[PDB]
Each structure stands twice: as structure tokens, then as C-alpha cells.
Write a protein that binds this ligand. Structure first.
Ligand SMILES: Nc1ncnc2c1ncn2[C@@H]1O[C@H](C[C@@H](N)CC[C@H](N)C(=O)O)[C@@H](O)[C@H]1O
Ligand SMILES: [Zn+2]
Ligand SMILES: [Zn+2]
Ligand SMILES: [Zn+2]
Ligand SMILES: [Zn+2]
Length: 323
């Protein structure tokens, strides 16, 4: 498939950089031919790669070997419509449930068939598909949308019909989890059911804020389940109206975080850190927004996942030196 071609002397270094940026397509075998290394890579453009690599490279097409199924079967049977949107090969597994990406236009009993296949080939108790928190269409197995998801050693109650939750962000949450220091006071601006907040358990105090009450209900259940009731303070409100202070501030709202930077700088103490999440073709825009608003330094930046062609969800840790 799509591969990143580089001189093999840079092999291990490039592999590591692709893994941290969720770009390594682990379903293929990195292959070495001649003095070149070919790394199977996920959807990405040459321009943004230049912001995470200083060596020369080439993106190319190439057959490579791999490291029942579902993705296997659906891919051929419905390749017709899949090939044109209707159906996606990508799906999410939140705890006990599976959520397919069937942009319905596909018949209903056709949707039940796929869900049924999924239910059959994928260990789960329920299968749904969708259409921000959107309405779900049940397609097989148990019809319960409430489940518990395990990640990074902790547990999270999630009701997929009520709040937004991406299991794909477990890696990014684990990254932050390890940077947290004992004396930190964390402000999780858009907490959902509390994933970053539970992840930041090393801190001495955490403020978990969200405007969705069901989200806050799951948050509370999660604070208890993980035994962090004397650590995490749940807050039902629009974050703009909350007056709290912290040295570590999390902004997990990609599409609109840019509209909340002023509030974030008001919460953050100087010398503190803001973990910003945004959508972009690269890191330039976000850096500029922050550079104009205060004196800061980027400490680490990562591509989190793809959003659409030449569009990605990005993470940047900004150290705020002076406001
Ligand atoms: N003005 C606001 N104040 C507080 N929370 C908000 C506001 N607007 C949206 N939200 C919440 O922002 C959240 C964005 C989600 N990406 C949070 C995900 C969560 N951090 C997780 O790790 O699962 C949603 O749960 C919204 O309910
Ligand atoms: Zn509720
Ligand atoms: Zn207490
Ligand atoms: Zn969101
Ligand atoms: Zn700045």
C-alpha cells in the first residue's frame, strides 16, 4: 500500500517517530530492499511529515506482506458501496459494544446483515452504527448502550448514546498520564466522562468540567469506581463560567478549542502547561495563535489521528512562560 521510503540508515529512528504519531500501519511488514526501508504508513501527506522529519523521504505505493475477520469479508462483498462511502471499514469498540460506520442509504436489512456479521466475528455483546453525540441504530446482540471500557489500567463507564467518547485516544491519554507530577493541580476543561481526569490521577487535585449532565453523571460513577473521590472535583457547567486555577490545563475539544484559549490562559498559572487539541493540516496555525496570545514554548507535539485528507487532530503541549 502507501509506504514511506527512506534510506535504511535512519530506520529505527523513523519507525519510532511514526509510531509516536500513530502513522505506522501495523498490518504490514516494514520491508528492506537494497539500502532502502519501506514503512507502511497511514493516510498522510508529505507536507506535514516535513514537520516531524528532517531526513529526505518519498511516499510511494507497494505490495508488502502482512504482520475469518470482518474487515476481510465486508471489504469484498460490499466493496461496491464501501468503495464509495456508504460503508467504512473502520469501526470502534467501546468496552462491550461495537459501533460500525454505516452511513445509511444502505438498506435496513442490509445494515442488520453487516451488524450481524460484526456481531458474529467480533467479540462483543452489542452492535450499533450512527446517524457531537449522535443517535444510534441498534443492529445486533444486546441493545444496551451503557458499558465499561478498560484502558491504561483504569475503568470507565460510558453510555455511547449519551456522551462522546473515543477509545482511539487511549494512547494520547497514556502519554499525558505519565507527564503528570504529584504536586500538579489539573483542570480538565472538557472532561466528558472523565478519561483525562482519571488518567491524571498522579496529581493532587483535578477539576473535571463538562456542560453535559449525563457526562457528569458518568464522571461521578467513574471517580468512585477508580477511588478518586478525594482527588477529582466534578463540575457541571459551561467551562467559561468556572473560576478555578491550575498548572496543567487540558483542552480536549479539537474542532473548537481555538475559541477557548483566552479562558484557558486565565485558568493556567504561569510556568504551567496547556495540552491543546485541534484540527489542522499541520502545527503552524496553533503555534501562531498561542505565540500571539502569550510567551510560550512547545514541549512536545503529536499527530493524534486523521480527520480527513490533509486534515488531522493534533496535540501540542505548550509551556506558558508569561501571560
Ligand atoms: N462550553 C463547554 N464547557 C464545558 N464543556 C463543554 C463545553 N462545550 C462542550 N463541552 C464538552 O466538551 C466535550 C468534548 C469531548 N471531546 C471531551 C472528551 C473527553 N475529554 C474524553 O477524553 O473522552 C464534550 O463532552 C462536551 O460535552
Ligand atoms: Zn443522565
Ligand atoms: Zn474528600
Ligand atoms: Zn469532542
Ligand atoms: Zn503563547
Amino acid at each position: 500500500p502507501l509506504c514511506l521510503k527512506i534510506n535504511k540508515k535512519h530506520g529505527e529512528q523513523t519507525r519510532r517517530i511514526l509510531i509516536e504519531n500513530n502513522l505506522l500501519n501495523k498490518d504490514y511488514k516494514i520491508t528492506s530492499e537494497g539500502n532502502y526501508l519501506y514503512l507502511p504508513i497511514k493516510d498522510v501527506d508529505e507536507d506535514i511529515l516535513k514537520s516531524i522529519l528532517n531526513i529526505e523521504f518519498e511516499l510511494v505505493d507497494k505490495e508488502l506482506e502482512e504482520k475469518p475477520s470482518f474487515r476481510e469479508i465486508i471489504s469484498k462483498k460490499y466493496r461496491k458501496e464501501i468503495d464509495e462511502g456508504l460503508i467504512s471499514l473502520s469501526y470502534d469498540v467501546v468496552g462491550d459494544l461495537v459501533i460500525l460506520q454505516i452511513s445509511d442509504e444502505v438498506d435496513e436489512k442490509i445494515r442488520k446483515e453487516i451488524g450481524e456479521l460484526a456481531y458474529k466475528l467480533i467479540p462483543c455483546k452489542g452492535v450499533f452504527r450512527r446517524k457531537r453525540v449522535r443517535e444510534l441504530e441498534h443492529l445486533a446482540g444486546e441493545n444496551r448502550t451503557l458499558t465499561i471500557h478498560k484502558e491504561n489500567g483504569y475503568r470507565l463507564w460510558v453510555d455511547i448514546a449519551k456522551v462522546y467518547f473515543s477509545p482511539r485516544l487511549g494512547g494520547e491519554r497514556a502519554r499525558i498520564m505519565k507527564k503528570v507530577s504529584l504536586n500538579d493541580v489539573v483542570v480538565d476543561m472538557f472532561a466528558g466522562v472523565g478519561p483525562f481526569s482519571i488518567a491524571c490521577k498522579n496529581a493532587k487535585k483535578i477539576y473535571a468540567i463538562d456542560i453535559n449532565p449525563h457526562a457528569i453523571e458518568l464522571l461521578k460513577k467513574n471517580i468512585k469506581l477508580n477511588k478518586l473521590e478525594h482527588k477529582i472535583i466534578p463540575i457541571l457547567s459551561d467551562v467559561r463560567e468556572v473560576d478555578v486555577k491550575g498548572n496543567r490545563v487540558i483542552m480536549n475539544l479539537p474542532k473548537f478549542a481555538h475559541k477557548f484559549i483566552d479562558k484557558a490562559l486565565d485558568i493556567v498559572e504561569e510556568g504551567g502547561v496547556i495540552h491543546y487539541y485541534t484540527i489542522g493540516k499541520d502545527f503552524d496555525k496553533a503555534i501562531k495563535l498561542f505565540e500571539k496570545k502569550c510567551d510560550c514554548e512547545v514541549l512536545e507535539k503529536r499527530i493524534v489521528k486523521s480527520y480527513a485528507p490533509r486534515e488531522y487532530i493534533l496535540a501540542l503541549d505548550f509551556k506558558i512562560n508569561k501571560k
